[PDB]
């Protein structure tokens, strides 16, 4: 009913603001779109669950995230995919470490602001 879609909408607004901060922090847009298989032909032979921020925006517009944890899973999937494919000497691996640091600095307050919608 109205009250349930209102709740889902206010929760999506909190997840969106967090995704936009992650997209903004990713200035080189390393994680904005799926990794280009024409540039990296062996990528999907190594990464079994590719993830990127644009896919997360689509899940959001479809109201696919029903808990904070489901959102976090996708952020940490992007990060752990980057560690799995790339060597630790590369700019990609360093940028994943940087966004993991940024995310870990934010998530406690955003996660609380999310639970507080249905308080």
């Amino acid at each position: 009913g109205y009250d349930e879609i209102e709740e889902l909408k206010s929760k999506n607004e909190v997840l969106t603001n967090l995704l936009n901060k992650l997209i903004a922090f990713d200035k080189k847009r390393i994680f904005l779109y799926p990794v280009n298989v024409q540039l990296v032909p062996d990528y999907l032979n190594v990464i079994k669950e590719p993830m990127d921020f644009t896919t997360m925006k689509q899940k959001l517009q479809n109201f696919k995230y029903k808990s904070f944890q489901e959102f976090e899973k996708d952020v940490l999937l992007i990060i752990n995919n980057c560690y799995t494919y790339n060597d630790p000497s590369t700019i990609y691996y360093k940028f994943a470490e940087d966004i993991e640091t940024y995310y870990k600095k934010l998530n406690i307050k955003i996660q609380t602001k999310y639970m507080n919608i249905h308080l």
Partner: peptide, 5 residues
């Protein structure tokens, strides 16, 4: 992985 750059 092979590598990107």
């Amino acid at each position: 992985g092979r590598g990107k750059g």
